[PDB]
Amino acid sequence: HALTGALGNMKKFQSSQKLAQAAMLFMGSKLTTLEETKELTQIFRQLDNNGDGQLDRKELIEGYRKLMQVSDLDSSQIEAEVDHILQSVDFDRNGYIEYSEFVTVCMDKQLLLSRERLLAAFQQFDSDGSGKITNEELGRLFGVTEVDDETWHQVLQECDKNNDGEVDFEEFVEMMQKICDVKV
Numbered sequence: 001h002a003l004t005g006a007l008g009n010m011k012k013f014q015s016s017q018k019l020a021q022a023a024m025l026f027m028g029s030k031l032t033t034l035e036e037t038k039e040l041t042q043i044f045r046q047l048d049n050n051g052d053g054q055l056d057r058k059e060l061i062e063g064y065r066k067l068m069q070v071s072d073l074d075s076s077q078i079e080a081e082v083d084h085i086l087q088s089v090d091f092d093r094n095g096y097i098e099y100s101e102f103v104t105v106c107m108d109k110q111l112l113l114s115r116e117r118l119l120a121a122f123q124q125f126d127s128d129g130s131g132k133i134t135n136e137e138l139g140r141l142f143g144v145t146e147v148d149d150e151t152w153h154q155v156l157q158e159c160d161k162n163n164d165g166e167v168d169f170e171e172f173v174e175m176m177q178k179i180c181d182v183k184v
């Protein structure tokens, strides 16, 4: 049943613009306690057949096949679910879902998006303490000096309500509320 819930949430999960992406992953990977995530750890271990810290394609396929236990058409439907997971949940594009990629996606967003976690992510990305996150600062998270215009446009359109080209904390929270459909 827990396995049903997490596979469900990985199904639903859709990609987002990069600031929201960097925020969720940072909160999920670094700001959560192992205590808070212990149920997700147990589920992850049930999927991780070879025990190496990451789910590959066969592991995810087996998770669905293990749940139902499967028609030739259910099989191709399962193939479709994993293809989706591997584009959306695999944030680093390495071909596996690491533990903390899995936790980020599968954790209750009401539980993840606490004001403390939001504000800690915020201040980590706002590296000069200016009170607003800029293009350069998003870029730093992805190892580059800036992000391209399309990337930044996507971010601004979602949350730059005052049209100043930067993301302040109030704007950051509203962005994350919309991405996760949650009131913070």
Ligand SMILES: [Ca+2]
Pocket (backbone or CB within 6 Å): 048, 049, 050, 051, 052, 053, 054, 055, 056, 059
């Ligand atoms: Ca594995």
Ligand SMILES: [Ca+2]
Pocket (backbone or CB within 6 Å): 090, 091, 092, 093, 094, 095, 096, 097, 098, 101
């Ligand atoms: Ca990955």
Ligand SMILES: [Ca+2]
Pocket (backbone or CB within 6 Å): 126, 127, 128, 129, 130, 131, 132, 133, 134, 137
């Ligand atoms: Ca700043």
Ligand SMILES: [Ca+2]
Pocket (backbone or CB within 6 Å): 159, 160, 161, 162, 163, 164, 165, 166, 167, 168, 171
């Ligand atoms: Ca702004």
Ligand SMILES: [Mg+2]
Pocket (backbone or CB within 6 Å): 045, 046, 047, 048, 049, 050, 051
């Ligand atoms: Mg295992």
